[PDB]
Design a binder for this molecule. Structure first.
Ligand SMILES: O=C(CC1CC1)N[C@@H](C(=O)NO)c1ccc(-c2cc(F)c(F)c(F)c2)cc1
Ligand SMILES: [Mg+2]
Ligand SMILES: [Mg+2]
Ligand SMILES: [Mg+2]
Ligand SMILES: [Mg+2]
Ligand SMILES: [Mg+2]
Ligand SMILES: [Zn+2]
Length: 889
């Protein structure tokens, strides 16, 4: 296995200036002709000319129109085409080839493949080499002239990058289109689509240049009525980049295309963004509420790449976070502005501190700019994306909006049209930092450690107040645990956004303040502090760290009720829950270990329950925030705080805490569930796909959360509400009715009813599969076998496989059954999927990421299955390298 090292970057000895492609799609094969106009670079030392090319069938290859002969002048080993240097010209030359590829059977969904009846490409990161020979790396920038031909009846719509400059008929019922894309681009941004596509379209006029941009959104004909929201989101994205960043689209046309079979969410191919249908298509009758925020974020994400990734691209793949972390940050700014709900930011934090913190304390931990890789297909991690986004967001926190915008423009202007590195972005931010500090000696050299140092910092606090001097001090310490990437961890530049709350009246005691912690520890002192405050720390979650606030639960309750910052309120609640969880967990664990006949559990803090009631009953409070405060922290967040976690004991702990709170608040929950109904389920705009109300959807989230709590509690006659909920027009509601009915004998009646409602829309059926998969059923294993035999079968569609199995893996009691049978089941699915889609097979390994954090019996059971998978003779490169890293082999 070849290991690529970041320190080994060197420019190529060759240049590719022009790519001229002819892609002729036929029934059983696709023939690709390519002429590369090439040159010798200043770095050339007379080496062999080596092209990437994976799985290509060579018809012929030539240099300057002279056919080369296999063996004497080149070798091809199905991975690399080597032309011996004695046959490589010394000046500008043309390399041409004709190869045969087979999209129909390309079930890995990389390169050129068929998704249902659509031919589609996916070239990031190194998939272009599966289409034709290339020096397949992002610093090889070239012009593209692309002709696609195909049967006209099956493939009437042909698309690639650039301007469509010719359309022509071909004998035998065929036709072609030629696309010329003069601006230089890396090959991972190449795309082609052919299909019987239907579309919606609009014209957008840019803010400053007043350019007319044609916007097209495509899907198969069956789902064309689900395209409206995506088009609205694209218009919103363009406006936001214009309004916040001053950036306009510079091309004549932008196409978005939905396909059913896609390894991830979407891809930013220049002018031809290609989407998983589940991240582009929705309608109010056939989609759950989550789809609306999903499409907004994914359309925005791919649009924002046009500057951060496409116009400014990557020198090499180790810079991935430069485009992905920065684009997620841009996406997050956009979504926060569009939704105007505090739960948007809270949802990103919630994901980071569960999924990404788990990754960063696992054997897979890496910095956002890794030092090495074997598989690019495994490189697209929550660390690179979501911790990368938080590192990009900290620049905005440190600089403030005005100077952040100044630094961002410096980055765009300096690097527009070229490749770039993480250092280029830090340099632009540093120029703004010097301006903000009015100090040309200021620098951000320390900030670069956020790119190189792995692991999550821990930040802890101690406080002192002198009542006579009116002087308050915050002593802060930071610590990152050593790991495999750094034996000694250096202190980071950690920005700590803080407020000081007067406990007597809940008011702010200081102006907006961002402490700049740059040492292992520092003490921050404030004068003229008239009373002892409660500190509001890391407002907005201002750094990606473990916060140890060292506050009492009384102080945390005061913040939860009265602080101004949504995150600190949510975090104060989180911390109260965690203290309770760890305490009850240890009490249950000791009772288990000591085989106690009787024991005591510490009850939930009664003032905390009172505060939850206070917030729930406040008609001025936010429904989305309310849904967070009645939910315990995610299991994957909890596990970062417990060694040798016994998942059964944790399940018992959660059950006790939920029952303690429900025994006090269920009547409040039921009253709110009923009173929220009119606004939550308002149908006034049900048939307007342009009208999306994020507050209303949060109201439904709250109702569906409360219904789940009441159903688990067997609240009297709650089954009446469940059955009525099943009649709601909103899929979020009627799919919730299925999941909460798990606790009642009507489950399979609602199983059948919701199946019939879901079965005729491909994406809705996948949402139904997820709902069944996450159902809290004692017979869940039998239910999964029924889904396999009756619905999933041998589908190779990743959306189908992920829907059936991933939600179930979050079933704490059943997936972690002490027999190991859930580990065995998912391992069988992984090995089966690995035969045709190694990238998705590795995604299905996600439940094993926490293996060494569980109790020793479950560690052994998980490790056994991973070793079984590693011993499969046909294991893919992706899955092997992933499992080797995960098992510390
Ligand atoms: O959709 C998402 C969610 C984030 C990953 C968490 N991310 C996508 C994104 O940033 N779009 O801008 C995205 C697009 C292509 C790939 C990709 C990489 C490969 F190497 C492949 F082989 C391949 F087929 C696809 C991975 C992620
Ligand atoms: Mg092949
Ligand atoms: Mg405008
Ligand atoms: Mg996102
Ligand atoms: Mg299908
Ligand atoms: Mg290791
Ligand atoms: Zn992206």
């Amino acid at each position: 296995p070849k290991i690529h090292y970041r320190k080994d970057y060197k420019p190529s000895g060759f240049i590719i200036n022009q790519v001229t492609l002819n892609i002729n799609i036929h029934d059983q094969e696709t023939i690709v002709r390519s002429v590369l106009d090439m040159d010798i670079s200043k770095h050339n030392v007379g080496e062999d000319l080596v092209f990437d090319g994976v799985g290509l069938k060579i018809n012929e290859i030539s240099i300057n129109n002279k056919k080369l002969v296999e063996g004497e002048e080149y070798t091809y080993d199905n991975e690399f085409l080597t032309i011996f240097s004695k046959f490589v010209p010394k000046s500008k030359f043309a390399f041409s080839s004709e190869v045969i590829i087979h999209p129909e059977t390309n079930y890995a969904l990389t390169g050129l493949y068929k998704s249902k009846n659509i031919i589609v490409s996916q070239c990031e990161a190194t998939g272009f080499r599966r289409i034709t020979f290339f020096i397949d790396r992002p610093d090889m920038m070239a012009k593209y002239d692309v002709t696609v031909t195909a049967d006209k009846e099956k493939y009437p719509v042909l698309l690639s990058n650039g301007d469509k400059v010719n359309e022509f008929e071909i004998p035998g019922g065929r036709h072609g289109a030629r696309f010329n894309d003069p601006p230089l681009k890396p090959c991972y941004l190449f795309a082609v689509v052919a299909g019987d596509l239907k579309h919606l379209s609009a014209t957008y006029i840019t803010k400053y240049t007043k350019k007319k941009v044609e916007l097209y959104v495509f899907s198969e004909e069956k789902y064309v009525s689900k395209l409206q929201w995506a088009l609205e989101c694209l218009k919103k994205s363009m406006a936001f980049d214009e309004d916040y960043f001053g950036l306009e689209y510079d091309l004549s046309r932008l196409n978005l295309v939905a396909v059913s079979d896609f390894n991830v969410g979407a891809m930013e191919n220049k002018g031809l963004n290609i989407f998983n249908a589940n991240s582009l298509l929705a309608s109010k009758k056939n989609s759950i509420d989550f789809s609306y925020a999903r499409i907004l974020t994914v359309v925005g994400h791919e649009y924002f790449h046009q500057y951060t990734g496409n116009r400014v691209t990557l020198r090499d793949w180790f810079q991935l976070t430069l485009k992905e972390g920065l684009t997620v940050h841009r996406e997050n700014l956009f979504s926060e502005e569009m939704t105007k709900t505090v739960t948007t930011r809270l949802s990103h934090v919630d994901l980071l501190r569960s999924v990404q913190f788990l990754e960063d304390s696992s054997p897979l931990s890496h910095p956002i700019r890794p030092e090495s890789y074997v598989s690019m297909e495994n490189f697209y991690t929550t660390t690179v994306y979501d911790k990368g986004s938080e590192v990009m967001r900290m620049y905005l926190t440190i600089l403030g909006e005005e100077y952040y915008k100044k630094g961002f423009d410096i980055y765009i202007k300096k690097n527009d049209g070229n490749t770039a590195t993480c250092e280029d972005f830090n340099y632009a931010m540093e120029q703004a930092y010097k301006m903000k500090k009015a100090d040309n000696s200021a620098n951000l050299n320390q900030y670069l450690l956020w790119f190189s140092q792995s692991g999550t910092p821990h930040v802890s606090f101690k406080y002192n107040y002198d009542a006579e001097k009116k002087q308050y001090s915050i002593h802060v310490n930071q610590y990152t645990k050593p790991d495999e990437n750094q034996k000694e961890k250096k202190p980071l530049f950690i920005p700590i956004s803080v407020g000081l709350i007067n406990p007597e009246n809940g008011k702010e005691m200081i102006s907006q303040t961002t402490l700049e912690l740059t040492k292992e520890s520092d003490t921050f002192v404030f004068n003229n502090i008239a009373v002892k405050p409660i500190p509001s720390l890391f407002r907005g979650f201002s750094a990606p760290v473990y916060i140890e606030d060292q506050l009492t639960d009384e102080e945390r309750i005061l913040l939860l009720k009265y602080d101004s910052d949504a995150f600190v309120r949510y975090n104060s609640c989180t911390n109260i829950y965690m203290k309770q969880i760890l305490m009850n967990y240890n009490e249950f664990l000791k009772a288990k270990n000591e085989k106690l006949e009787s024991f005591q559990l510490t009850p939930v803090n009664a003032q905390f329950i009172d505060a939850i009631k206070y917030l729930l009953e406040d008609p001025h409070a936010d429904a989305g925030f309310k849904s967070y405060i009645v939910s315990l922290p995610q299991d994957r967040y909890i596990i970062n705080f417990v060694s040798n976690l016994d998942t059964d004991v944790l399940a018992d702990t959660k059950e006790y805490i939920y029952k303690q709170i429900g025994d006090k608040l269920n009547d409040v929950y039921y009253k709110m569930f009923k009173s929220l109904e009119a606004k939550a389920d308002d149908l006034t705009y049900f048939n307007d796909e342009s009208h999306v109300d994020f507050d209303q959807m949060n109201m439904r989230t709250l109702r569906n959360t409360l219904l789940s709590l009441l159903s688990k509690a067997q609240y009297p006659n709650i089954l009446n509400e469940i059955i009525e909920h099943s009649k709601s027009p909103y899929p979020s509601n009627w799919l919730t009715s299925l999941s909460v009915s798990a606790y009642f004998d009507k489950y399979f009646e609602l199983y059948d009813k919701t199946y019939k409602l879901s079965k005729d829309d491909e994406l809705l059926l996948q949402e139904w599969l997820k709902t069944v998969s996450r159902s809290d059923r004692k017979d869940i294993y039998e239910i999964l076998k029924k889904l396999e035999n009756e619905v999933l079968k041998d589908s190779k569609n990743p959306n189908d496989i992920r829907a059936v199995y991933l939600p179930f893996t979050n079933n704490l009691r059943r997936f972690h059954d002490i027999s190991g049978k859930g580990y065995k089941l998912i391992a069988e699915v992984i090995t089966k999927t690995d035969k045709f889609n190694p990238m998705v097979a590795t995604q299905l390994c996600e439940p094993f990421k926490l293996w060494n954090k569980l109790d020793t019996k479950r560690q052994e059971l998980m490790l056994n299955e991973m070793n079984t998978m590693l011993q499969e003779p046909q294991i893919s490169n992706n899955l092997k390298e992933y499992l080797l890293r995960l098992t510390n082999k």
